[model samples]
Target: KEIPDVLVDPRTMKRYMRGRFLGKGGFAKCYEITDMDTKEVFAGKVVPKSMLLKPHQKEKMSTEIAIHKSLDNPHVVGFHGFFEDDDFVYVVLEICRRRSLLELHKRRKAVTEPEARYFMRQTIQGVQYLHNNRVIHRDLKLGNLFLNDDMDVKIGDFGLATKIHSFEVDIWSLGCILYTLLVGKPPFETSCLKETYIRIKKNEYSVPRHINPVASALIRRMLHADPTLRPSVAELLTDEFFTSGYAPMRLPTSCLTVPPR
Candidate 1:
C-alpha cells in the first residue's frame, strides 16, 4: 500500500501534507509534515500498520506514544499529537531541522570541552525531566539527542522507553554520549558486538589522559560498574565540569561542521 501524500486523521479531521523525508527508524519513516490549515510544521513519524501486525509490536508503539504524550519539557522534544489512518499511525512531533548530535559527532569528532559541556548540560536536563516523571529512556544515545535551529538539544525517540524507570540506566547512556563527545569515539566500541558487551560487563574502558580531569571524573562515575555509584540526574548539572567551563548559551551553526573557535 502506498502512503498518501496528504494524511487525513479521521478523529480531528485534520490534514497533514507530508513533506521532506527526515529519516527512518526500526519500523517508522519520519517526514517533515505541515498542517494544511494552520501552516505549522511537525516531524511526522509514520509507522505502517503492517509493522505493528503483531500484538506485541502494536503494544510497544502504543506504550511509546503514551509515555511521550505525557511529557512536557524544554529539553525534551514536544509531542503535538497522534492519529491513525488505514495504512499508518502518524505521530506529530517538534521538528528538529539540524538532525541529531550523532550527525554532529560523526562530522566533528572530539568536540571542544565547552561544546561538550553545553550539549551534556542540556541533555542531562532533559534526562532529569524524564526521571522526575518516573520515565526511563532506556535507549539514550547521541542519535536521540536532536538539535533545533537555535542549537538546543531536544532528547527524543522513546521506542525503548518505559514508565517504571531505573534512573541509572539513562545515566549510563549519558555517560557513553559524553565520552563519545569528548573522546571522539564510544568508550566500549569494538569490532564485535559481543566483545563490546563483554567490555561493558567488565567495566573495561579508560578515559584518555588528554580529557579534562573534571570531565573524565564525571564520565567515570556515570559509567561505574555499580549503578549505585552513578551520579543522580540532579547532581549532573552541578558538576564541576559544567561550572568550571565557559559553556556557550547559544552555539553557532558552524559548530555543526567544525568545532567552535
Candidate 2:
C-alpha cells in the first residue's frame, strides 16, 4: 500500500525526514534521512516503483529487503526499517561515514599483512554470522565491504546475496577481496571482463612476490577452481595468520566521509 510523503517506521511510528541525495544503484537511489524524534541520521536506499514493474526486478528487490530485515550483527550493516510510497520503497540503514573498501583500496593501493588481517577478521566474523543465521552473501567484493564511522568493517550490499545456499560463492568473493587488499587487484584481474572470466575459470592467477608464504597459501586455497577445497570462514579464522593484532594502516581519509544531512 502507498504511504504518504512522510515515511513512518512501522515499529515506532516515528517519521523519517528524507534529506540529501546520497548515491544510486542499479534500481534504487540512496539519500541521507533523519529520524524525526531521535535526530539520528541514516542512509536510505529508495527504489522507484517503476523499477519493480517487472517480476524479476521485484523478486531481487524483495530478496535484498529480506536479507536486510533478517540480520542483526555488529559487523553487518544495520537495517533500521522500510516504508513504501506510490513511487518508491524506502529502506533505512546505518550510515557508514567511511565509504566502501573499493574507494579505500584505491587510495592506499596496498596493505600490510596486519592491516589486511584486520579487515579479514571483521569480514570473517560478519560472514560467519550470516552463515550461522542461514544467509549466503553471494557477492563479497571490496565495494560491498564498508567502513563505519570509526573505520571498522561493516559487510553490506546484499543485492546479489542469497539464503542458506551458495556458500562457496562467498568464500570465492572473500578470496577476491583478500587478493585485492594485498595486491590492489583481484586474483583474476585482466584488461577486460571476458579475459577475467576465462582466467577465473582456469584458476589462473599469480601470488604477488611481496605476499608472505602463509597469506599466499591461504589465498591459493580460497581461490581454487574447486570450491570444495576453500576453507570455511571458521577454518580460516583459526589459521596462524590471524594471531597478530591489527595495526592501523591508511584508512580512507578523504572521500569516505558522510555529508551532514
Candidate 3:
C-alpha cells in the first residue's frame, strides 16, 4: 500500500497529511506534515516505538518533549504539541524550510567572517536564553542549528538537552560548531574515532594556519578540556571576536537556499 494520505491523531482527532521525509537521526525520522483543516505546515519528528533498540531510548523521547515544552524563545524552535499512535510518538514543531546549518555549510564549505559572526551572535543569544532558563543544550552542533527563510538561526533538537547550571558542556559543543563553520570541520576530527577521542581528551587540536588568530583564541577558550576553564556563554558574546566593530553581512540570497529534505 502507498503511504497513508492522512494520519489522524488519536488524542486530538486532528488529521495531518504526510509530506516529505525531512531528515533521519539516531531516534526518529522527521517528515514534513500538513494540518488538513488549517492547511498549516510543520515538522513532525516521528519516533516509532518498535524502532527503539533499548527500552531506555523510549524514555529519551518522553524526556525530549518534557524538556522542549519548557523552552520558549525565538532563537529556539517552537514546540507545537505531540500526538501518538499505537506505533509512534510524533513531536510537532514549527517549520523552517531552510533546514540545518550543516546543510548550508555543506553547500558553501565555509561562511565569511561577518556571515559567521551574525549566525554566531544569534546562536550565542539562543544559548544564553537556554542558560537563563537553566537548560543545557548538551548536544549543540551544526546539524541541530536550523536556518529559517530569513536566515535567522534556530536552535532545535532538545533530545539530549538537560537542566543544569554548568556552562562547560554547551560551550564545548558550541566551540566545535563554530570551528566547523570557520574551518569546514571540527578541530578534533580525525579518520579514527579512537584518535579523535584521544585528541579531545588531551585537548590537542590544530587550527588552520590561515584562520584568524582572534577566532582561534576564542575557540581555544571554549574547547578547554578542563570544563572549568571554558568561557561562560555571556563572556564569549562580549569577546573581541564578537564585540570589535563588526558589521552585519547581508549574505547572498543563494546562501539561504533550502536543501530538499
Candidate 4:
C-alpha cells in the first residue's frame, strides 16, 4: 500500500514510474521502474525505512550503496543512481531481463561444458574487477549473477559485499558455482542445512568421474580448505578449464531454455 505508482526523489527531483514487481530480497523489494523523462527502464530496489531502524542495519545499507556506486564494469551490474524519500529508499540499477544464472540452473541442470566455460569466464571477469578494486563479494552465488538480454553475466546484489577484501571466499564460491554449472547441484549440498555446513567445512565433495579432469582440477584448488591455497582471481582466466575448452564468446538466447547446438 505504501509503494507509490510514481517514485519521486526529493534530492534530484526526478520522477520514476513504478511498474511490475521484479523480485524481493531480505528487506528490499525490486520492481521495474522507468524514468519518466527518458522512458529508460531500470530495476529499482526499494527498501522501507522501517526495516533499517537499527543503526547497524542502516550502516549496512549505506555500505552496500557506497561499494556498489564505485563499481564500473561490463560484467558488473550498472549502478544508475540512488535516492530516498520519507517512506522508502530507491536504488536504480541495470535491468537484467533474463533474470539470474540460478534461474537458468534450475531450468536446465548440468549445463554443457562449453556453456559452463562461457558462464564461468564472464563471472570471473566480474570478480576480477571487484578484486582489483579491493572489493570482496562475500556472497557470490548463482542468484547474484544476473543475465541481461544479450546473455551477458552481470554480477549484482552487493548486500553482503564488503570493501576490504581477502579474495578467497569469493573464489570458493566461484568453485561452487562452476561445480554446480557442470554437475547440476551445489558441491556440498545435503538434506540437512547443518550437514551441508559440515561437508563444506570438511571440504568433502567429489567431482563426478565424467567431469573434465582439467575442470575438476581447478575446482579442487578453488575449494581447498586453506583459503590461501586458492588461485587468485587473475589466475582463473588462465586455468586449463577455460583455456582448453571450446568457449563461445556469445551464447544464443535459446541456451536460456535449452542447451545450445
TM-score per prediction, in order, is 0.98, 0.89, 0.91, 0.98
True-structure RMSD, every candidate: 0.9, 4.3, 3.3, 1.0
Enumerate clash totals for all models, in the order shown: 0, 0, 0, 0
The lDDT of model 4 is: 0.93
CA-lDDT, candidates in order = 0.93, 0.79, 0.82, 0.93
Clashes of 2: 0
lDDT of 4 by residue, 73-145 (tens): 9999999889988888889999999999999999999999999999999999999999999999999989999
Tell me the lDDT of model 1 at 251: 95
Better of 2 and 3 by TM-score: 3
Model 3 reaches what TM-score against the true structure?
A: 0.91
Please give the lDDT score at residue 170 for candidate 1: 91
Per-residue lDDT, model 3, residue 161, is 89
Among all windows of ten consecutive residues in candidate 3, which has the lowest summed lDDT? 252-261
